[PDB]
Symmetry: D2
Subunit: 178 residues, 4 copies
Amino acid sequence: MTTRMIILNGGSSAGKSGIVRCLQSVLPEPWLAFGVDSLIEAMPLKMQSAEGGIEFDADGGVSIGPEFRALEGAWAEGVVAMARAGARIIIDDVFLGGAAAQERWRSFVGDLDVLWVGVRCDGAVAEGRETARGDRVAGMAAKQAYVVHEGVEYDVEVDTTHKESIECAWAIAAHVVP
Amino acid sequence: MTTRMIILNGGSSAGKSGIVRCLQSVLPEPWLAFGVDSLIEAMPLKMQSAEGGIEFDADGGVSIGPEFRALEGAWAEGVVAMARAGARIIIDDVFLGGAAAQERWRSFVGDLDVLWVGVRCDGAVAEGRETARGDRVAGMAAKQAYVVHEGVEYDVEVDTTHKESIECAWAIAAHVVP
Amino acid sequence: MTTRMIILNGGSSAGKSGIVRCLQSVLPEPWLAFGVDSLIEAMPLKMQSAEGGIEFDADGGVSIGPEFRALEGAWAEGVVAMARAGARIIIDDVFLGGAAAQERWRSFVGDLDVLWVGVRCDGAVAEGRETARGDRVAGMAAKQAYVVHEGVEYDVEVDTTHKESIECAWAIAAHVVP
Amino acid sequence: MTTRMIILNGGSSAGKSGIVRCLQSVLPEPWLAFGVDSLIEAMPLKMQSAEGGIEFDADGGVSIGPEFRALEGAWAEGVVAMARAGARIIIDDVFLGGAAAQERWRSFVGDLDVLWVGVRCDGAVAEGRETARGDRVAGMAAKQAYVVHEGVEYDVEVDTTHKESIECAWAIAAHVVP
Ligand SMILES: O=C(N[C@H](CO)[C@H](O)c1ccc([N+](=O)[O-])cc1)C(Cl)Cl
Ligand SMILES: O=C(N[C@H](CO)[C@H](O)c1ccc([N+](=O)[O-])cc1)C(Cl)Cl
Ligand SMILES: O=C(N[C@H](CO)[C@H](O)c1ccc([N+](=O)[O-])cc1)C(Cl)Cl
Ligand SMILES: O=C(N[C@H](CO)[C@H](O)c1ccc([N+](=O)[O-])cc1)C(Cl)Cl
Ligand SMILES: O=C(N[C@H](CO)[C@H](O)c1ccc([N+](=O)[O-])cc1)C(Cl)Cl
Ligand SMILES: O=C(N[C@H](CO)[C@H](O)c1ccc([N+](=O)[O-])cc1)C(Cl)Cl
Ligand SMILES: O=C(N[C@H](CO)[C@H](O)c1ccc([N+](=O)[O-])cc1)C(Cl)Cl
Ligand SMILES: O=C(N[C@H](CO)[C@H](O)c1ccc([N+](=O)[O-])cc1)C(Cl)Cl
């Protein structure tokens, strides 16, 4: 029953990265963190200008093509492989495809023990934080705030609308089996 | 009565930068933002290793020497000069010297119309956010949370302990005379 | 004859920022660094989406409107004011307007002692570095490589095409009167 | 004979990251990039303050403990797993242990087709660039410039002392079998 992977899902500006660093500080054993964002940074820059890659609409929409998806797949497998190799992994994701996305993960994970975490946050509030951070495309927060969880099943749910990252971290750590 | 400068004061991780970007988005006229941090980034790197410069204790303490202070002074004058030249300026500061610090500003400002803003936040909560951001020296938040406001007089006060940046932004904008 | 300001001019990716940090390390007295880029970061984000602000064409072109120019002006005056106040200032600029730009500076500077530095670099090579850094809009380097110096007069010229930043730094420092 | 992984080795400031982005732009197929630095960013912050983790001496030295090494191991396996899954991977490493380090990789890689790249650069020059970038601990460049290659065998060697990143990129791409 030892937890091997902690997969978090939430919309942009919902507070995931903040929760991730807190978890890494709180949890006693070292946990590696990776996510759709670190994956993007690891993909070639041109992937962001290629049709079957990832595209950022000016209104904050996000489109994903097969070239991008294909790469992501091998990446996912590698992350699972790290867990298998004995590294405790935290995944900061954004299930744009809702349930479809969670399934995709389930397939790569297999019988590996995973803690599915849901990070919610009022769209309006997320949108406010989006402005405050100033480093995201205005509109992503709102567009993602809800559709991301539709049909997704979690083992734990935190809502950053009125809870600090460190607090949400404590709630999540409590469900982590050593 | 037109506001020329908005000087914010608060401890590390209290939420100032977030409020600043919100203000820049909210306010109709363009406001330039500068602060102790941009000043630091503009000072030579070695200033951070020189005795009369700025020193960061491992426990999160911050010491300021005369070499640093001298530079800061000319900088302050320049910022005031920008206001005088007609640029709307926002200053994100950290009054380590409490009232002493506010006086220092008053001297540079003169009869220029300034909106003194206080950004408060529970030390414990600030410390939590400090961990979540992971890019500050652990301990700064708590050490600064309160001593920074002792003896300081504001025209407006916001407390980020339970208020989003955008909200605090709205409260502050309301006191800005066009 | 003491040098109060060091104004560098060069196209994107020509190597200015690198030379700037070297100068700050080399020069014995503390020099504050500021530039078109720090100014941009200090301007509201929306300035980048407003017509009379600054616009970044997808091919790497850069357009500047009056709203942006107006702000820049007050900023320039403030920087000069810092020099006057006794702070040694380094300005990392990009004379898009060639000679016109240098004149604009001359007007703000007045009789202040300034060291005009020219940072050149082969367009092709600059374009290569542009790719290597991956954090600029492809095409800026080439578009700026030359037009930026047309009609501009320097006291010192360095060419980073075959010279390291630290070397160019040494050449520039040598012309700085204490 | 299709190349699955490109493993680059070089000392800090030798120019690897710059070469990596160029390769990602040059190579026709998408290549994911990862390295000791992205791994560090993915490890908990505290790993940098824990004895068996990674420690940064003030003079630029770097020490690695077993806790850090253990994690790195599972990470290495995961990266190899990504290659196996069909993702083209580029690894930006720093063989502090010289030959010992290359062996460690050979063990994880197995019979996977790998292109071993060596990125050299004169210590003095690397040290100069270290200053110019200003975001590394002074002294790392020099300490690493040479010891890193002792006993290491490459399929290709580039020297950034007098060659631009894009050029070195071209030399390396030429040895990549599709
Ligand atoms: O802005 C970014 N990422 C955010 C999420 O952190 C963006 O909203 C996003 C959402 C989903 C996504 N995906 O699922 O492939 C990619 C980017 C990075 Cl490009 Cl910096
Ligand atoms: O190289 C490109 N495109 C082709 C299709 O025109 C290609 O198959 C591709 C798309 C994205 C990509 N990536 O992320 O590196 C790589 C190759 C464009 Cl990005 Cl210029
Ligand atoms: O960490 C930093 N700054 C914070 C404040 O944002 C630090 O707490 C600090 C506080 C006061 C200060 N001062 O008043 O000179 C300088 C740095 C910068 Cl060095 Cl990145
Ligand atoms: O140059 C240095 N120090 C002397 C005193 O030893 C000097 O007067 C000084 C201190 C800080 C500084 N700065 O911020 O650039 C500049 C010069 C050290 Cl930083 Cl190496
Ligand atoms: O990319 C940027 N700046 C470069 C120069 O460093 C861009 O080429 C540029 C050039 C000139 C300019 N101007 O003169 O107003 C503004 C940006 C910043 Cl937006 Cl990050
Ligand atoms: O606020 C805006 N525009 C008007 C004109 O429609 C305005 O006068 C302005 C433009 C740029 C700007 N800035 O940089 O903050 C401020 C106000 C747009 Cl940026 Cl939404
Ligand atoms: O400074 C850093 N990394 C450089 C290399 O890019 C440092 O020189 C270093 C070298 C070797 C290393 N290792 O082999 O574990 C880790 C960091 C990161 Cl901590 Cl930002
Ligand atoms: O938690 C810590 N240490 C113990 C040993 O005292 C621990 O086993 C450990 C070290 C590094 C680490 N990491 O990278 O997350 C995790 C746990 C210190 Cl970092 Cl406070």
